[model samples]
Target chain A: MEFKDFPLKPEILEALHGRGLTTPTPIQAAALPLALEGKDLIGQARTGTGKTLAFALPIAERLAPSQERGRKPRALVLTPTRELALQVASELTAVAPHLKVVAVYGGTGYGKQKEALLRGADAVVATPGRALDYLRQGVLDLSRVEVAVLDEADEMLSMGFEEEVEALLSATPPSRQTLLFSATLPSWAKRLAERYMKNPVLINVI
Target chain B: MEFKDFPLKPEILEALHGRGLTTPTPIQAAALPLALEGKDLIGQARTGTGKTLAFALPIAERLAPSQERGRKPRALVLTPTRELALQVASELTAVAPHLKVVAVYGGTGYGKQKEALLRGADAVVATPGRALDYLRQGVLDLSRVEVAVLDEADEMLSMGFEEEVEALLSATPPSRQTLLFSATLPSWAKRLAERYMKNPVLINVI
Candidate 1:
């Protein structure tokens, strides 16, 4: 599928052009339309399949055109680690910046992250541990989060942070779209989908 | 296919039932037969479809019964993060621990991580970055790495670590079987398929 046909916002299109990316991988072709329709989804996708843009494109396109001076995060991406958070953030802003996406992960200075959130970016991509830290510290609030994506859901459970994921999701409004994307699913992950997501569009690409 | 019919070791059978898992997902269903037959594979299965166990099972089943307790690693599963490395190791243990599997990633004490490599586990599950660190430090050697699996190959590229993954594969003996599992295929990953893998069984579930 061509990126141009994906119903993405202009900024994303520009970014894709900047990077010379005009094609969508299989996973993208399947997940992009569903996500853009504002439906909760479970993308049975692995990392390299361009899963980032599948969700990022929709989130960016769905985001409100404009907000007050400082925006509270509306789109939240939970990755498994720092590198992934960075990768997601970079991929998200590719064509252009529709919304400022700040990445929050561990093993780095905290002060800089805090300010990024304090200033209020339109979207926030964070690791569960660091995101939870900010959540518990009142520095991060999910009340405004309308779209929540768990990029590596299986890995999140594998890391023993299942509870944090639940906590974060519970804190978000039930009306928010919750998408779980992973390469593999054990029973726990299956159960997780049943419990939190409401009839999500199950895109099983494997 | 039923677990009863699969070519898994008895211990793996015990673990599968222990988790009440008997049926294979599409990813596992397609990859297992070929992987067991010693075919190199690129599992084009999405996340949450059982790609981890697909490769882990084969790698574990193919290892020598008992290598000199501390012999260098014969199998390696390079992931994108600590969570996944640990998850893959633990999951590999559940189905088959024919060889002890060690989880290697950064964000922890070097002594413990280094000790595991030195002790020579059967399979090493590591992140590309951390694995490279060990490689350069001379604490980990790939000369004996006969089975190499790059789980989430696309994410490894998106993170801009193509060189690390390539370098690791190059270090392994030419006769090694390289298995790359991902949800989507990019031009780079496709090129990798042509160059690195042996007549790989490209199982695309999407």
Candidate 2:
């Protein structure tokens, strides 16, 4: 099915169409409907299966546009590595430029990230370590998170970020929409989902 | 070309055949010949293009087998992240099981890695940070590295591991063969190769 067929906003559709992205990828088609319906989801898909859009689109459609200063992020995407955090943030901004997307990761200076968060962020894509650091410093808040995505869940666990991920996720409201994505659902990741997600729909597009 | 056509050792060939890997992917076909010749090379290829084997094969073929105590690693592969380090190490072990391959990365304890190094390692796949940590502690030696590979060079630099990567490379002997693989060769990465690599052959398979 085409991206236009999904119940995406005209602004998102316009950005997608501008990039010549009309067709929906397998993962997108499988995850979008349930995700947009505000159901918790477990998307088992690989990197090239257009997994980023599956979560990004739902977040864009659900979260109200706001760039007000000191307004906590409404959507949060946690990645395993700094590069992936930047990439996912870039993709989200590309598709939904109207939203303020900030990426916080390690191995780099935090000045820009802190300034961006202080200015306001509709969505924040982050690596666990830096995100946790900011959360501890009272520079960021997850209490207002309406959509919390655990991108590459298995990777985070395997990289020994299980505790950090749990800590960050715990800060978000339990009533928030939890979207879990992983290429493989290891037992540990499954356990994470059980604790955090509520009756999540399993979408295995791999 | 097929795996059987390449001048691989019987054991390596047996492993490849067992895994039903016959035909070479584009990156592998383009890189194997030059890599096997022990030439310092730059390969531009993305993941899933068989980039790992391009370097792993030559490393397996060239490094002499040794698991003796106090032996230094003959081959070294530095990855941007811990996950890639583990993956490359696993792939090397799969293709050349005879070689003692050890992976060193941060986000975990040093006991097992130090123990592995103390026992002996013919090949070491490591993240720049962890590798530098061991180097500073005098637990890991790079002076004996015959083939030094920087996998995902662009990613490493972008993640601000430039100094760590350069420091690790500097620890190795200048005469060592260097293999640089990156999806995109940014100016900084080009400058890096100029500093550490000796007239690397550019092989863009992207």
Question: Evaluated with DockQ, which candidate comes out highest?
Answer: 1
Pick the lDDT winner: 2
Give the per-residue lDDT of model 2 (tens digit) for B151-203: 99999989999999999999999989899999998998989889988756555
Query: Looking at model 2 chain B, which ten-residue stretch has the lowest summed lDDT?
Result: B25-34
lDDT of 2 by residue, A1-206 (tens): 46776678989999998999997665565466667768787877879989899899999899768758778999999999989999999999989877989999989898989998988899999999999999999998999999999999999998999998999999999989999999898999989988999866555545
**lDDT scores of the candidates, listed in order:** 0.79, 0.86
| Model 2: chain A TM-score against the true structure | 0.97
Candidate 1 docking class: incorrect
| Clashes per candidate, residues 3 or more apart or on different chains | 14, 0
> Once superposed on the true structure, which residue ranges of model 2 sit more than 4 Å away at CA?
B1-206
**Cα DockQ of the candidate 2 complex:** 0.01
